[PDB]
């Protein structure tokens, strides 16, 4: 019958106000859901190349890599070193088969860059915040449910807002701007101009989003086989993509 497998990566970043990356963290998991007959054995093939850790001898370079990996106690690793194959007899229902972590660069560019322009009349109290968001995914690929959260100085009110496209929404709530951008593709540049009154702590911006058909680490499941219909997904998500302004 049916087997579902997902590679799911949670991304966290801290980006400095000048655009330079300070921190990157990916926590990845491979999750399996299946309902197979008695004694059924499954093999999972990963990206052929990929290395684990930081070899003192060989160093570490571009290539697909993770800083550490761990495996469910039922997984047999006899073919992992030579072929990156995992083997196991799954239970009925859900299992996490593998976890991994990456803290060093990504093999691909970060999905979002923000270009803020802030002018603050100290003044009439007028605060103008211009935000341009650039998606640096490929033009084919999509970011879903993108929301930007931006803390604002105490007691700020919205005077006006102009968004670069009709499908965006934005509101002040809970002392912060919430900007929703439900249409975002690689290469998109979306922007918002916000006029507020302040009667610093502006920022940092925190983005949240899902990236379907994507892994931040570059890791992929190459095959899934019995020794049934198959659904294989690769997803990255973030609720902690922090950009100082």
């Amino acid at each position: 019958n049916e087997v579902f497998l997902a590679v799911v990566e949670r991304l966290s970043v801290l980006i400095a106000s000048n655009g330079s990356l300070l921190k990157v963290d990916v926590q990845g998991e491979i999750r399996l859901k299946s309902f197979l007959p008695s004694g059924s054995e499954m093999r999972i093939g990963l990206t052929e190349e990929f290395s684990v850790g930081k070899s003192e001898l060989r160093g570490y370079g571009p290539g697909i890599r993770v800083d550490e990996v761990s495996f469910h106690s039922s997984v047999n690793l006899d073919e992992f070193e030579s072929h990156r194959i995992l083997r196991l007899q799954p239970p009925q229902g859900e299992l996490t088969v593998m976890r991994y972590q990456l803290s060093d660069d990504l093999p691909s560019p970060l999905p979002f860059r923000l270009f803020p322009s802030v002018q603050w009349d100290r003044g009439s109290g007028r605060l103008q915040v211009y935000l341009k968001l650039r998606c640096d995914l490929l033009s084919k690929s999509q970011a879903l449910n993108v929301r930007l959260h931006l803390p604002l100085p105490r007691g700020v009110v919205s005077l006006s807002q102009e968004l670069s496209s009709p499908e965006q929404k934005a509101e002040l709530a809970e002392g912060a701007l919430r900007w929703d951008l439900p249409r975002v593709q690689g290469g998109s540049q979306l922007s918002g101009l916000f006029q507020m009154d302040v009667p610093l702590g502006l920022g940092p911006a925190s983005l949240s989003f899902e990236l379907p058909r994507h892994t931040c680490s570059g890791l992929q499941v190459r095959f899934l086989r019995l020794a049934p219909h198959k659904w294989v997904r690769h997803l990255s998500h973030s609720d902690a993509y922090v950009i100082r302004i």
Binding site: E68, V69, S70, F71, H72, S73, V75, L77, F80, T96, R99
Partner: peptide, 7 residues
């Protein structure tokens, strides 16, 4: 040589 978890 490898780390394992139970869940």
């Amino acid at each position: 040589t490898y780390k394992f978890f139970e869940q």
